[PDB]
């Protein structure tokens, strides 16, 4: 059942893939590996074929490679980037070295959408609706995205959306950078263990922006960002304070001049009041009191799209491997096993 593979060198990289993938075209690269756009003659879609570079260079890499493959194979939802195929030209574990992932190619991320046009409220309900729909699925499996942002949301000409490369160095989070602007404060300052409510905070930031055309919390750094946040939602109370482990963070938080939550109706002037209500429920300083993806889908803002019968949950995702210490060669074997055992949808 092994498909026939064919080799070729495109932009200094050798690609050895099944013949079902045609017209490969280099669409970029990075620290992760090279990526080609291709015509998948089986599904008929335009796909992204990524060749992982040195997936087993070290224990840490070998694990990351395994983790991403595991996460991609699990996701089966219209609003979440799923795995269309995974392969290696190797005929055995001894020859196993390169890994290729095939995912659907959506076109552009949310950032590129907003650059080309001005989104109506109807566009925003639909886009947030889909994000929440995919998040309910993700969360039902006890999986946290961890780094939801406009660049991690692919959209197409029909406004359909899919959540991309989930959270898998802080340097990328320093300064006036977008990569940190959508992060819940409790994880930004390592105040506590992050749970899925961290994603709901990212959604509020994104929805606010789509409504105003402006970044909700464009901090010049972590502290500046924290002040922009506390200013909007108020400084912490005693109940939220007890939940912060670090005695230093508490002392710091208690040093700030206390402020009340601002009126969201006067921040998001002219926005649909339902959207304003929902944002107040998403941007709650205490993560335990944030609205859940499931609860949010049922909020009146989404009445035109909500359908409790077309908002599926996922099968349990087993992440026991996360707390497992193995050698590079063992992680590689596990990875190999996941590849050859892949079953097309």
Swiss-Prot record:
Resulting phenotype, residue 321 to S: Emulation of the active state. Increase in activity
GO terms classed as biological process:
3'-UTR-mediated mRNA stabilization; angiogenesis; apoptotic process; bone development; cartilage condensation; cell morphogenesis; cell surface receptor protein serine/threonine kinase signaling pathway; cell surface receptor signaling pathway
Q: Main location per UniProt?
A: cytoplasm
Cofactors required: Mg(2+)
Q: Which residues carry this modification: Phosphotyrosine?
A: 176, 317
Q: Which residues bind ATP?
A: 27-35, 50
Q: What's the reported outcome of changing residue 169 to A? A: No effect on either the kinase activity or tyrosine phosphorylation
Q: What EC number(s) does the entry state?
A: 2.7.11.24
Q: In which tissues is it expressed?
A: Brain, heart, placenta, pancreas and skeletal muscle. Expressed to a lesser extent in lung, liver and kidney.
| Effect caused by changing residue 314 to T | Lowered kinase activity
- Where does the record place the Protein kinase domain? 21-302
- Which keywords annotate this record? Acetylation, Apoptosis, ATP-binding, Cytoplasm, Kinase, Nucleotide-binding, Nucleus, Phosphoprotein, Serine/threonine-protein kinase, Stress response, Transcription, Transcription regulation, Transferase, Ubl conjugation
Where does it reside? Cytoplasm; Nucleus
Residues annotated as carrying Phosphothreonine in the record are 13, 174, 257
Q: Name one Pfam family in it.
A: Pkinase
The role this protein plays is: Serine/threonine kinase which acts as an essential component of the MAP kinase signal transduction pathway. MAPK14 is one of the four p38 MAPKs which play an important role in the cascades of cellular responses evoked by extracellular stimuli such as pro-inflammatory cytokines or physical stress leading to direct activation of transcription factors. Accordingly, p38 MAPKs phosphorylate a broad range of proteins and it has been estimated that they may have approximately 200 to 300 substrates each. (Microbial infection) Activated by phosphorylation by M.tuberculosis EsxA in T-cells leading to inhibition of IFN-gamma production; phosphorylation is apparent within 15 minutes and is inhibited by kinase-specific inhibitors SB203580 and siRNA.
User: What does the entry note on its domains?
Assistant: The TXY motif contains the threonine and tyrosine residues whose phosphorylation activates the MAP kinases.
This protein is called what? Mitogen-activated protein kinase 14
């Amino acid at each position: 059942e092994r498909p026939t593979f064919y080799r070729q060198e495109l932009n200094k990289t050798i690609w050895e893939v099944p013949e079902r993938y045609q017209n490969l075209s280099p669409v970029g690269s990075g620290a992760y590996g090279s990526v080609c756009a291709a015509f998948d003659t089986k599904t008929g879609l335009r796909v992204a074929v990524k060749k992982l570079s040195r997936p087993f260079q070290s224990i840490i890499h070998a694990k990351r490679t395994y983790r991403e493959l595991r996460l991609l194979k699990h996701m089966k939802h219209e609003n979440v980037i799923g795995l269309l195929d995974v392969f290696t030209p190797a005929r055995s574990l001894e020859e196993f070295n390169d890994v290729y992932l095939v995912t659907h190619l959506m076109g552009a991320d949310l950032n590129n959408i907003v650059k080309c046009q001005k989104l109506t409220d109807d566009h925003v309900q639909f886009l947030i609706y889909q994000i929440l729909r995919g998040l309910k699925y993700i969360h039902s499996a006890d999986i946290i995205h961890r780094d939801l942002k406009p660049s991690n949301l692919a959209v197409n000409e029909d406004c359909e959306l899919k959540i991309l490369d989930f959270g898998l160095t802080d340097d990328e989070m320093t300064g006036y950078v977008a990569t940190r602007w959508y992060r819940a404060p409790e994880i930004m300052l390592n105040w506590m263990h992050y749970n899925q409510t961290v994603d709901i905070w990212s959604v509020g930031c994104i929805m606010a922006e789509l409504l105003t055309g402006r970044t909700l919390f464009p901090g010049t750094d972590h502290i500046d960002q924290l002040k922009l946040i506390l200013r909007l939602v108020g400084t912490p109370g005693a109940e939220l304070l007890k939940k912060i482990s670090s005695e230093s963070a508490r002392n710091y938080i208690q040093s700030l001049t206390q402020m009340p939550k601002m009126n969201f109706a006067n921040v998001f002037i002219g926005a649909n009041p339902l959207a304003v209500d929902l944002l107040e429920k998403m941007l709650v300083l205490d993560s335990d009191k944030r609205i859940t993806a499931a609860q949010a889908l049922a909020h009146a803002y989404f009445a035109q799209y909500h359908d409790p019968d077309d908002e599926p949950v996922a099968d349990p995702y087993d992440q026991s491997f996360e707390s497992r210490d193995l050698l590079i060669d063992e992680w590689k074997s596990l990875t190999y096993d996941e590849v050859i055992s892949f079953v097309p949808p």
